[PDB]
Each structure stands twice: as structure tokens, then as C-alpha cells.
């Protein structure tokens, strides 16, 4: 494909045109100029649309990757977000979605492309900023990129995702999403990010309404007849519960929203992920806290956890047994 070289040259030429204008319109050089290049007048959206389509095939990605395809599409997305900010211009939205879909495809299963995209810091900052965009379609695409970047990432990529504030932005985004399709991609990204380190977990917990929102995902009613939202929301909660266990205020938010009760209902789910997530959360919340220990005893948790210790699923067996052990080791005074 020399068609691919031609498409990339088109995008680089346009970016070159934009970096000329931008270098004469930095924040300090504060008086503006009316001729700012518009991508509509360089036929840009069709170019990235073709690259996006071809990025679905691995054979075409090997080609793109030799030719600098990831760098060019990222720069394009960066430069348009920098130039026009959070616009509702349908052309600029569409351009961003297609570029974002291409980057989702080019990050898929490619640890170097993930690091390269992460190393492009201005692009990352622009990606993160787009979670505020009023297009939920754009939000879903951006969440899908941050998801792929956060799965099986190297140390620098994980560091970068943290530094640019992707965790907080995603959690705040999740609170406003209407569509189940956007929420699915936002929570997948968060579930990936929540496993990386303790600071990501703490940043999720530190957003106002986030913990209550996460407890709410445990009883989400899917229109699309899937359990993805309960699974991913319950997964995030499980990962952050290690820190919640140490924070009486955060436990109280969980109590406010009947968390423990719902988690015990989850123990009798047929979804293995739901059961495993609940075992894991209950493992953490059953430790170090007489109030929650007593509530679990009162709500029949001991017997419910005992029914899962012989599970063939290993995380359920381990999780249920460790939670059971925490309750047996700390009987309340009214028990003997
Ligand atoms: C290993 S299972 C799993 N569990 C939790 C999280 C993830 C995860 O983040 N997986 C990503 C990255 C994998 C990797 O880098 O090795 C992933 O698999 N992404 C896929 C979509 C996908 C598939 C399966 C699962 C399972 C569980 C959770 C999440 C996902 C996500 C991906 O990006 N695929 C692209 C197509 C390939 C052929 C390249 C893709 O979806 N491209 C579409 C153009 C993008 C798009 C974006 C938004 C809206 C419309 C279209 N894994």
C-alpha cells in the first residue's frame, strides 16, 4: 500500500500546516489570526476514515506502523483538540472519533504502540480532555483507547496514564454518562486502571459520589440483556475495597447504599465474575471492622460463604474461605 503512504502524507501535510499556525499562536503570543486551517477544507476526515477502516486488519497495521501511522493520527487528533477545544462541530467530532478508533486498533495487543502513544504526552492530555465532550459517541471511543492503553501496559505507560489524570477524568465521566454503550467502555478502562496501583484506587475513591455510583452499578438494569456493567462496576469496587476497608467514611458510604447486603445476593449469582468480585470485596470488608463483621453475621454471610469454599473456580474458593475465616475469627459479643 502506497495509498497508505499517500494518506499519511496528507495527514502530516495538514498537521504541518497546523503546527505552523500553532507555533505563531502559542498561549503567550496572545493576539490571534483569522486564517486558522480547518480540516474540512483539506479533505481530512475521509483520509482518517480510510486509515481507520484499514487499521482493523493486522496486515495493514504492520504497514502503518512502519510508516509512522500511529504518530501521525495521534498528532492529528492532538492538534485538532488543541486548536478547536471542546467543540460540537460535527466534522471535528467525526474526525476525532475516526482517529480515536484507529488508535484503539493500533494499540490493540501492541505494547510498543501503547508506550509510544503514552509517550506522546500532549496527545494523552487531549485524549483525557475529550471525556468532557458532549458527544457520548466520542466519549466511548476515548474510553476505548484509555482501556487498551491500560491493559497489560509497561511501567512507563502506567505511570503516564496516572500522571495525566485519566482515572479521575474517567470516574467523573462515568457519573454523567447516559448510554449503556459509553458506560461499558468507561468502566472497562477504570477496571483496568484500578488494578495498577494503590494511587489509582485512592483516586477512584476520592471522587464525590463515585463510591455510591459504583455500589449502584451492582444493581444496574441492562436494556441490552448483559451483565457487563454489574461485572465491571463490581470489579472496580473489588479492586478499590482494599483501601475502603481502612476508611470508615468510605465504609459508611457503602453502608448508606446497602453494599454488604447486595454483595451477599451476588454470592448466589450464576455469573462467575459477579460471584468472584463479591467474594473479593467481602474478603476485604470482612477484615479490621467489628461493625461490618457483625452486619455480615446478622445477614447470614457465614452460611452463604461456606457454600462457596468448595467451588471449582479458584478465586471464589479462596475469596469465600478467606472472608469466612475473617468472620469466624471475629464473632460479635452477642455470638459465642
Ligand atoms: C483479555 S480480556 C480483557 N479483560 C479486560 C480488559 C481487556 C482489554 O482492555 N482488552 C483490550 C486490549 C487487549 C490488548 O491490548 O491485548 C481489547 O481486547 N480491546 C478490543 C475490544 C475488546 C475485546 C474484548 C474485551 C473483553 C473484555 C473487556 C474488554 C474487551 C474489549 C479492541 O480494542 N478491539 C478493536 C478491534 C481489533 C480487531 C483491533 C476494536 O474494538 N476496535 C473498534 C474501532 C474501535 C471502536 C471504539 C469505540 C466504538 C466503536 C469502535 N481485556
From Swiss-Prot:
Source organism, top-level taxon: Eukaryota
Q: In which tissues is it expressed?
A: Expressed in a variety of tissues: brain, small intestine, colon, thymus, skeletal muscle, heart, prostate, lung, spleen, ovary, testis kidney, placenta, blood and liver. Isoform 1A: Very strongly expressed in brain but has relatively low expression levels in other tissues. Isoform 1B: Predominant form in all tissues except for brain, including gastric mucosa and blood.
Instruction: Tell me what the record says results from residue 147 to E.
Output: Impairs interaction with KHDRBS1
The ARM repeat ranges on this chain: 51-93, 103-145, 146-189, 190-236, 237-281, 282-323
Q: How is it modified after translation?
A: Phosphorylated; phosphorylation enhances the F-actin bundling activity. Phosphorylated by GSK3B.
Q: Main role? A: Tumor suppressor. Promotes rapid degradation of CTNNB1 and participates in Wnt signaling as a negative regulator. APC activity is correlated with its phosphorylation state. Activates the GEF activity of SPATA13 and ARHGEF4. Plays a role in hepatocyte growth factor (HGF)-induced cell migration. Required for MMP9 up-regulation via the JNK signaling pathway in colorectal tumor cells. Associates with both microtubules and actin filaments, components of the cytoskeleton. Plays a role in mediating the organization of F-actin into ordered bundles.
Oligomeric state and interaction partners are given as:
Forms homooligomers. Found in a complex consisting of ARHGEF4, APC and CTNNB1. Found in a complex composed of MACF1, APC, AXIN1, CTNNB1 and GSK3B. The complex composed, at least, of APC, CTNNB1 and GSK3B interacts with JPT1; the interaction requires the inactive form of GSK3B (phosphorylated at 'Ser-9'). Interacts with APC2. Interacts with DLG1 (via PDZ domains) and DLG3 (via PDZ domains). Interacts with alpha- and beta-catenins. Interacts with AXIN1 (via RGS domain). Interacts with ARHGEF4 (via N-terminus).
State the disease link: Familial adenomatous polyposis 1: An autosomal dominant cancer predisposition syndrome characterized by adenomatous polyps of the colon and rectum, but also of upper gastrointestinal tract (ampullary, duodenal and gastric adenomas). This is a viciously premalignant disease with one or more polyps progressing through dysplasia to malignancy in untreated gene carriers with a median age at diagnosis of 40 years. Desmoid disease, hereditary: An autosomal dominant disease characterized by multifocal fibromatosis of the abdominal wall and mesentery. Desmoid tumors can also affect paraspinal muscles, breast, occiput, arms, and lower ribs.
What does UniProt say about this protein's domains?
The microtubule tip localization signal (MtLS) motif; mediates interaction with MAPRE1 and targeting to the growing microtubule plus ends. The basic region (residues 2167-2674) mediates the association with both microtubule and actin proteins and promotes the bundling of F-actin.
Protein name, per record = Adenomatous polyposis coli protein
Recorded source organism is: Homo sapiens
Amino acid at each position: 500500500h502506497h495509498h497508505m503512504l499517500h494518506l499519511l502524507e496528507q495527514i502530516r501535510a495538514y498537521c504541518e500546516t497546523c503546527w505552523e499556525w500553532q507555533e505563531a499562536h502559542e498561549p503567550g503570543m496572545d493576539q490571534d489570526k483569522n486564517p486558522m486551517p480547518a480540516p474540512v477544507e483539506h479533505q481530512i476526515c475521509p483520509a482518517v476514515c480510510v486509515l481507520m477502516k484499514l487499521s482493523f486488519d493486522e496486515e495493514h497495521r504492520h504497514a502503518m506502523n512502519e510508516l509512522g501511522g500511529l504518530q501521525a493520527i495521534a498528532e492529528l487528533l492532538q492538534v485538532d483538540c488543541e486548536m478547536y477545544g471542546l467543540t460540537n462541530d460535527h466534522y471535528s467530532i467525526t474526525l476525532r472519533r475516526y482517529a480515536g478508533m484507529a488508535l484503539t486498533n493500533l494499540t490493540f495487543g501492541d505494547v510498543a504502540n501503547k508506550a509510544t502513544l503514552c509517550s506522546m504526552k500532549g496527545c494523552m492530555r487531549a485524549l483525557v480532555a475529550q471525556l468532557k465532550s458532549e458527544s457520548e459517541d466520542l466519549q466511548q471511543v476515548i474510553a476505548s483507547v484509555l482501556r487498551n492503553l491500560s491493559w497489560r501496559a509497561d511501567v512507563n505507560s502506567k505511570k503516564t496514564l496516572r500522571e495525566v489524570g485519566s482515572v479521575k477524568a474517567l470516574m467523573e465521566c462515568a457519573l454523567e454518562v447516559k448510554k449503556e454503550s459509553t458506560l461499558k467502555s468507561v468502566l472497562s478502562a477504570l477496571w483496568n486502571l484500578s488494578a495498577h496501583c494503590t494511587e489509582n484506587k485512592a483516586d477512584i475513591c476520592a471522587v464525590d459520589g463515585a463510591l455510591a455510583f459504583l455500589v449502584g452499578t451492582l444493581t444496574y438494569r441492562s436494556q441490552t440483556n448483559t451483565l457487563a456493567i454489574i461485572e465491571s462496576g463490581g470489579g472496580i469496587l473489588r479492586n478499590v475495597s482494599s483501601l475502603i476497608a481502612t476508611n470508615e467514611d468510605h465504609r459508611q458510604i457503602l453502608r448508606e447504599n446497602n453494599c454488604l447486603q447486595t454483595l451477599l445476593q451476588h454470592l448466589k449469582s450464576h455469573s462467575l465474575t459477579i460471584v468472584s468480585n463479591a467474594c473479593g470485596t467481602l474478603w476485604n470488608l470482612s477484615a479490621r471492622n467489628p461493625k461490618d463483621q457483625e452486619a455480615l453475621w446478622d445477614m447470614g454471610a457465614v452460611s452463604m460463604l461456606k457454600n462457596l469454599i468448595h467451588s471449582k473456580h479458584k478465586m471464589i474458593a479462596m475469596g469465600s474461605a478467606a472472608a469466612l475465616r475473617n468472620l469466624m475469627a471475629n464473632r460479635p459479643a452477642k455470638y459465642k
